[PDB]
Amino acid sequence: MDDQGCPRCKTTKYRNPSLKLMVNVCGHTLCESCVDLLFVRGAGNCPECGTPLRKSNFRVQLFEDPTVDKEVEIRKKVLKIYNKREEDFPSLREYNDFLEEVEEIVFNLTNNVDLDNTKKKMEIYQKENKDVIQKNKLKLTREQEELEEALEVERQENEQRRLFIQKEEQLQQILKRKNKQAFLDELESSDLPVALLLAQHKDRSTQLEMQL
């Protein structure tokens, strides 16, 4: 009831309103119920022509994110080995050459040029794939250790802060509740040290610096 549901039988989107569709690799429209029937009728095919697929590659995003097909292939192609191609150079480069030459070929895949095996067969053959992977292994172990500790110190401190607020609430309350209850029985069973007023002033002056 929003775009056209699936181009298959229209028993998914017109009947169920509380479910969204999925998007294959090349930026097409397909409902979620034609995923199960896509497994016994072709095993990874785009349901308008018959384009073959991978392990279903169904991004479930109706936020107009993969509708631009250039977007979802950046998620494909940059994250493919080109992420792994990338970050070894911002570790150690000359000054920008290992950025911008490497920046150039980003444009030379997004245009469906199909000059890629020319670069895939020179992709990691000049350098060490383990040296590539280990920096991917370095950075990912770096960043997951980095993000969790950032998540913990923002979890610990404010909770420690609000508990420090919470105990100071508990501090000021029962202090006030007891020191006057102390000041209550201060008179009861004793008419103050040597005068009507004396230590009952004395106690009426000692209890403010205890909060202060």
Added chain:
Amino acid sequence: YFPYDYIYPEQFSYMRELKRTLDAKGHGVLEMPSGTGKTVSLLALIMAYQRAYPLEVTKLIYCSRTVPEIEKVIEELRKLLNFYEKQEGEKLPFLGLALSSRKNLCIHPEVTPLRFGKDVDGKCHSLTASYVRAQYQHDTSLPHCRFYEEFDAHGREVPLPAGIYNLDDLKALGRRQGWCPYFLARYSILHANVVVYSYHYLLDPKIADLVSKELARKAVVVFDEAHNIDNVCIDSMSVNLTRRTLDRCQGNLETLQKTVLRIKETDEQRLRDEYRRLVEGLREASAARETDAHLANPVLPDEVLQEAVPGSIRTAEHFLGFLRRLLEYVKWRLRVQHVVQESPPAFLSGLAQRVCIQRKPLRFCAERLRSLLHTLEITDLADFSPLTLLANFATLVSTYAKGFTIIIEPFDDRTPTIANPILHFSCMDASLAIKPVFERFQSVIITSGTLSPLDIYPKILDFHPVTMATFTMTLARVCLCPMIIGRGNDQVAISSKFETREDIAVIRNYGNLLLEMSAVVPDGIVAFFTSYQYMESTVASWYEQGILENIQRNKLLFIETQDGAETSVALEKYQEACENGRGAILLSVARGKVSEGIDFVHHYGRAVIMFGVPYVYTQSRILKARLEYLRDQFQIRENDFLTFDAMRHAAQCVGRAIRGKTDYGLMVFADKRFARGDKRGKLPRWIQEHLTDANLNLTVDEGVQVAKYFLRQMAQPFHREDQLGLSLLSLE
């Protein structure tokens, strides 16, 4: 040195204020009464310090907050210019530059009378340095911006202008000699000796409006009424983002692509010659008015943009970076609309998952946004304006986010549905907005006639050698009547405990306390409501239930509108409807922007009634991060400034209606919160002799006779009020 007559024994109270804050390079905080000629006090010693080349150097920048009072500054100092001129003999050279570029601009009739400022200045600059910079020679298309070329001629030459002009003064010179307010200003900034402009214009971090050369040798800048600096500085870096904006931006995404597609090598090889020069030696392409249409520096306190040409080598590639940005940014928007989320540096981190190359193309974007349009030099600016918003944003997200704050506000604020979600990037450190100010300056003086707690300069989080309390005497009988109400009969509930719409039983006697104020007090009253819907709530019972039945019969009423157009109307009336046979009490809002730029006189406007605690009450969760950071600064501040924020706006609004020092003022206080808060917020010169001498819980019916007793006495017997002649020590 203009003592010029009895000057209500104050210039001597401010004489050593200069000599302490200036000779010793003191940063300096001044209390001032609202009835003290705010430059006649200040500039009379400042212009005295102007001639006093006490070692060598005396700059002057000045700013205030409203352009009519900007000219009102200029207005009588011209006689002060003339004053000692006859007295010291000859007349030396001078310049005071009112530098307006927003409204006052253009003398061409095709350009001028379109209402807004920014868009029409985009038409101006698109004509000058985008059409006549691209299509240089021509006859028709090139349009007649002829006196820019006259600026070319006399910018090759050397004239010497006269004294201080105004916005309109150069416009007749525009129709005679003085050329362009911008240019006729760029050449005068070259040898400017005094600048007056808006407090806002200096404090633009979006387009970093660098006024002078960065010359902190003795950079001498003066500040009046510098109250709501946070409401400047945080709002100066506040970034709103409309969904309607993004979709319009989404529409001119591929619109600009069509310009890319139609241009094959004409503008493209123009880039190719100079994008190579971008790699070889970094220099901005334009030094003229193009930078006015350009984000000068979104994040000013940085070192340099050294490795420009970021992880982006081509233009559609750079355009794809915004396709990588905006389309992800709505992905960072549209799903996020269910939950308000305050995570400023966590966003850019999760963005780094989504954005392929980050933190350089985040920061090196807005110029490459502009520069790849600069090889075009095609797109009209108002068309391109919602885009410059966006490359400003992630640039700000790139640099200063861990001290600052991201807030996402999709829910109900004028949208009953979710029909316009928004987020905001606020900063928090107005310090870090004014730290670069202070590093660029020498030691510069705030003066705020409302600032009673000096403890809020460390809300600016800064250091101060000079911060005292100005005490003036009153031999003017009695300066004013401050009158805290606290009715006992109708049982004061004037703070919104049961809120502005929780009960109208509270509201049953604001009319009663007003009509009797209306019945007694003549001569025009300007009162202060809290907000517009509050104002809409204020008069809500007033029509249907019987309220105005005597109120319109006594004086008349001036509604101020949410729209500033109709708001300026009653104004045209109020200056007139008082000065004829009518009292005509105006009705207004404190926090609304009707409360600046006026300086009410004894002629019209001489009384103010408080209505409620003048605090914020509106914007959700802009508090808490601002709260907790000052709780990360001083830790008991929830109670503290959330009093003073009301108070710093209160006498900002309330303490206005007296100018000289006999001008009267009936500043009564209908308030439930007075016990410490009003007392802390009122001036130490003003709590002392006047506030609650023996009048606190003053029921209006009793407080009726107070103003009666006040005015009737105060109207007669005036001749002599604190007459100073010669110097007789007195020693305060």
